[PDB]
Ligand binder design. Structure first.
Ligand SMILES: COc1ccccc1N1CCN(c2nc3c(c(=O)[nH]2)CCCC3)CC1
Ligand SMILES: [Zn+2]
Lengths: 162, 47
Protein backbone atom coordinates (compact mmCIF):
# COMPACT_ATOMS: atom_id res chain seq x y z
CA UNK A 1 0.00 0.00 0.00
CA UNK A 2 2.56 2.59 1.06
CA UNK A 3 5.07 4.19 -1.32
CA UNK A 4 7.90 6.50 -0.16
CA UNK A 5 9.07 9.21 -2.57
CA UNK A 6 12.54 10.58 -1.86
CA UNK A 7 12.59 14.37 -2.06
CA UNK A 8 15.60 16.16 -3.58
CA UNK A 9 17.45 18.63 -1.30
CA UNK A 10 17.20 21.07 -4.25
CA UNK A 11 13.39 20.85 -4.09
CA UNK A 12 11.56 23.69 -2.32
CA UNK A 13 9.43 21.06 -0.57
CA UNK A 14 12.49 19.44 1.04
CA UNK A 15 13.90 22.80 2.13
CA UNK A 16 10.54 23.81 3.61
CA UNK A 17 10.21 20.63 5.66
CA UNK A 18 13.82 20.90 6.86
CA UNK A 19 13.27 24.51 7.92
CA UNK A 20 10.28 23.44 10.02
CA UNK A 21 12.45 20.77 11.72
CA UNK A 22 15.38 23.10 12.40
CA UNK A 23 13.47 26.23 13.39
CA UNK A 24 11.40 24.45 16.08
CA UNK A 25 14.31 23.12 18.12
CA UNK A 26 14.22 24.37 21.69
CA UNK A 27 15.98 23.60 24.94
CA UNK A 28 14.27 21.09 27.19
CA UNK A 29 13.90 21.22 30.96
CA UNK A 30 15.64 17.84 31.27
CA UNK A 31 18.88 19.30 29.88
CA UNK A 32 18.84 16.72 27.09
CA UNK A 33 18.26 13.60 29.21
CA UNK A 34 15.52 12.08 27.03
CA UNK A 35 16.37 13.33 23.55
CA UNK A 36 20.05 14.33 23.65
CA UNK A 37 22.04 17.56 23.58
CA UNK A 38 21.85 19.47 20.29
CA UNK A 39 20.80 22.76 18.75
CA UNK A 40 20.24 21.50 15.19
CA UNK A 41 19.93 18.35 13.09
CA UNK A 42 21.78 16.82 10.17
CA UNK A 43 18.88 16.08 7.82
CA UNK A 44 19.77 12.93 5.90
CA UNK A 45 16.60 12.21 3.92
CA UNK A 46 13.00 13.40 3.56
CA UNK A 47 10.45 11.07 1.95
CA UNK A 48 6.83 11.81 1.03
CA UNK A 49 4.52 9.07 2.35
CA UNK A 50 1.93 7.98 -0.23
CA UNK A 51 -0.96 5.65 0.63
CA UNK A 52 -4.35 6.01 -1.07
CA UNK A 53 -6.31 4.05 1.56
CA UNK A 54 -4.84 5.96 4.51
CA UNK A 55 -5.26 9.33 2.76
CA UNK A 56 -8.92 8.74 1.89
CA UNK A 57 -9.46 7.57 5.46
CA UNK A 58 -7.95 10.87 6.61
CA UNK A 59 -9.85 13.15 4.24
CA UNK A 60 -13.12 11.34 4.98
CA UNK A 61 -12.76 12.07 8.69
CA UNK A 62 -11.51 15.61 7.98
CA UNK A 63 -14.78 16.46 6.22
CA UNK A 64 -16.88 15.10 9.08
CA UNK A 65 -14.91 17.17 11.60
CA UNK A 66 -15.06 20.29 9.42
CA UNK A 67 -18.86 20.11 9.28
CA UNK A 68 -19.10 19.84 13.09
CA UNK A 69 -16.87 22.91 13.59
CA UNK A 70 -18.29 25.79 11.53
CA UNK A 71 -16.75 24.38 8.32
CA UNK A 72 -13.23 24.53 9.75
CA UNK A 73 -11.09 21.38 9.90
CA UNK A 74 -8.41 23.22 11.91
CA UNK A 75 -5.74 21.23 10.07
CA UNK A 76 -2.12 21.46 11.25
CA UNK A 77 1.29 20.05 10.28
CA UNK A 78 2.85 18.59 13.42
CA UNK A 79 5.69 16.32 14.47
CA UNK A 80 5.41 12.80 15.84
CA UNK A 81 8.37 10.77 17.10
CA UNK A 82 7.87 7.11 17.90
CA UNK A 83 9.55 3.70 17.81
CA UNK A 84 6.56 2.57 15.73
CA UNK A 85 7.23 4.81 12.72
CA UNK A 86 7.50 1.89 10.30
CA UNK A 87 4.12 0.51 11.36
CA UNK A 88 2.53 3.99 11.21
CA UNK A 89 3.48 4.75 7.60
CA UNK A 90 2.15 1.38 6.42
CA UNK A 91 -0.98 0.92 8.54
CA UNK A 92 -1.72 4.39 9.95
CA UNK A 93 -2.22 5.47 13.54
CA UNK A 94 -4.57 3.36 15.66
CA UNK A 95 -5.48 2.67 19.30
CA UNK A 96 -2.31 0.66 19.96
CA UNK A 97 -0.44 3.98 19.61
CA UNK A 98 -2.49 5.59 22.39
CA UNK A 99 -0.13 7.03 25.01
CA UNK A 100 -1.89 5.90 28.19
CA UNK A 101 0.58 7.83 30.31
CA UNK A 102 0.15 11.13 28.46
CA UNK A 103 -0.87 14.22 30.40
CA UNK A 104 -4.11 14.62 28.41
CA UNK A 105 -5.31 11.02 28.38
CA UNK A 106 -4.85 7.96 26.20
CA UNK A 107 -4.50 9.37 22.69
CA UNK A 108 -2.06 10.11 19.87
CA UNK A 109 0.29 13.01 20.67
CA UNK A 110 1.87 15.57 18.32
CA UNK A 111 4.28 18.48 18.88
CA UNK A 112 4.95 21.86 17.33
CA UNK A 113 8.56 21.60 18.63
CA UNK A 114 10.44 19.02 16.57
CA UNK A 115 12.79 18.56 19.54
CA UNK A 116 9.85 17.55 21.75
CA UNK A 117 8.99 14.74 19.33
CA UNK A 118 12.68 13.79 19.19
CA UNK A 119 12.42 12.82 22.88
CA UNK A 120 10.17 9.87 21.90
CA UNK A 121 11.95 8.38 18.89
CA UNK A 122 13.64 5.80 21.12
CA UNK A 123 10.60 5.42 23.41
CA UNK A 124 8.99 7.06 26.41
CA UNK A 125 11.54 9.40 27.95
CA UNK A 126 13.99 8.37 25.25
CA UNK A 127 13.79 4.75 26.43
CA UNK A 128 17.34 3.45 26.64
CA UNK A 129 18.47 5.48 23.62
CA UNK A 130 19.73 4.11 20.34
CA UNK A 131 19.76 0.31 19.97
CA UNK A 132 23.46 0.14 19.02
CA UNK A 133 25.04 2.29 21.74
CA UNK A 134 22.18 2.66 24.29
CA UNK A 135 22.84 6.40 24.06
CA UNK A 136 19.91 8.79 24.26
CA UNK A 137 22.27 11.50 22.98
CA UNK A 138 23.79 9.40 20.19
CA UNK A 139 25.25 11.55 17.42
CA UNK A 140 25.92 8.53 15.17
CA UNK A 141 22.73 6.50 14.71
CA UNK A 142 20.07 7.69 12.28
CA UNK A 143 16.74 8.77 13.74
CA UNK A 144 13.33 9.16 12.11
CA UNK A 145 10.44 11.56 12.84
CA UNK A 146 7.09 11.97 11.13
CA UNK A 147 5.79 15.35 9.97
CA UNK A 148 2.03 14.76 9.96
CA UNK A 149 -1.17 16.37 8.70
CA UNK A 150 -3.48 16.55 11.74
CA UNK A 151 -7.17 17.52 11.96
CA UNK A 152 -7.86 19.28 15.28
CA UNK A 153 -11.43 20.46 14.74
CA UNK A 154 -12.77 22.15 17.85
CA UNK A 155 -9.75 21.76 20.15
CA UNK A 156 -10.14 21.78 23.91
CA UNK A 157 -7.68 24.24 25.41
CA UNK A 158 -5.85 22.72 28.37
CA UNK A 159 -3.20 24.91 29.91
CA UNK A 160 -0.38 22.71 31.16
CA UNK A 161 2.12 23.42 33.92
CA UNK A 162 5.11 22.85 31.57
CA UNK B 1 -8.00 4.99 23.60
CA UNK B 2 -9.83 7.77 25.48
CA UNK B 3 -12.25 10.44 24.21
CA UNK B 4 -11.88 14.16 23.69
CA UNK B 5 -14.19 16.35 25.78
CA UNK B 6 -17.81 16.45 24.58
CA UNK B 7 -18.28 18.77 21.63
CA UNK B 8 -14.55 18.61 20.80
CA UNK B 9 -12.30 16.83 18.32
CA UNK B 10 -8.88 17.11 20.01
CA UNK B 11 -7.05 18.62 22.96
CA UNK B 12 -4.50 21.45 22.79
CA UNK B 13 -1.99 21.15 25.60
CA UNK B 14 -0.47 24.59 25.93
CA UNK B 15 2.49 25.04 28.32
CA UNK B 16 1.83 28.04 30.56
CA UNK B 17 5.17 28.15 32.48
CA UNK B 18 7.93 27.83 29.88
CA UNK B 19 7.22 30.77 27.55
CA UNK B 20 9.40 29.21 24.82
CA UNK B 21 7.71 25.81 24.73
CA UNK B 22 5.26 25.39 21.87
CA UNK B 23 1.95 23.54 22.01
CA UNK B 24 1.33 19.79 22.08
CA UNK B 25 -1.87 18.28 20.67
CA UNK B 26 -3.82 15.06 21.24
CA UNK B 27 -6.30 13.29 18.97
CA UNK B 28 -8.33 10.25 19.92
CA UNK B 29 -8.98 8.77 16.45
CA UNK B 30 -6.17 7.42 14.29
CA UNK B 31 -7.99 8.64 11.18
CA UNK B 32 -7.49 12.30 12.23
CA UNK B 33 -3.78 12.26 11.31
CA UNK B 34 -1.91 11.31 8.13
CA UNK B 35 1.85 10.64 8.31
CA UNK B 36 2.83 12.82 5.34
CA UNK B 37 6.65 13.13 5.64
CA UNK B 38 9.21 10.63 6.95
CA UNK B 39 12.36 12.51 8.00
CA UNK B 40 15.67 10.69 8.58
CA UNK B 41 18.19 12.73 10.57
CA UNK B 42 20.93 12.84 13.21
CA UNK B 43 21.13 15.25 16.14
CA UNK B 44 24.31 17.32 15.93
CA UNK B 45 26.76 17.73 18.80
CA UNK B 46 27.05 21.47 19.61
CA UNK B 47 30.35 23.05 18.59
C1 LIG C 1 1.94 3.85 23.34
O1 LIG C 1 3.05 4.76 23.45
C2 LIG C 1 4.36 4.31 23.44
C3 LIG C 1 4.71 3.03 23.91
C4 LIG C 1 6.03 2.58 23.87
C5 LIG C 1 7.02 3.43 23.38
C6 LIG C 1 6.67 4.71 22.91
C7 LIG C 1 5.34 5.19 22.91
N1 LIG C 1 4.92 6.47 22.46
C8 LIG C 1 4.89 7.54 23.47
C9 LIG C 1 4.11 8.73 23.00
N2 LIG C 1 4.66 9.36 21.81
C10 LIG C 1 4.80 10.72 21.67
N3 LIG C 1 4.46 11.54 22.66
C11 LIG C 1 4.62 12.91 22.51
C12 LIG C 1 5.12 13.49 21.37
C13 LIG C 1 5.49 12.59 20.32
O2 LIG C 1 5.96 12.90 19.20
N4 LIG C 1 5.34 11.19 20.47
C14 LIG C 1 5.29 14.96 21.19
C15 LIG C 1 4.42 15.81 22.15
C16 LIG C 1 4.52 15.31 23.57
C17 LIG C 1 4.22 13.80 23.68
C18 LIG C 1 4.98 8.34 20.76
C19 LIG C 1 5.59 7.01 21.25
ZN1 LIG D 1 23.92 5.00 18.55
Amino acid sequence: GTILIDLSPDDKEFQSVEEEMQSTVREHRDGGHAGGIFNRYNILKIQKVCNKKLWERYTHRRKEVSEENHNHANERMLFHGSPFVNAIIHKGFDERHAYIGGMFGAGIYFAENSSKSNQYVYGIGGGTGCPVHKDRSCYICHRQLLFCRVTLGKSFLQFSAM
Amino acid sequence: MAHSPPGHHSVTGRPSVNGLALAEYVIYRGEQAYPEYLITYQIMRPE
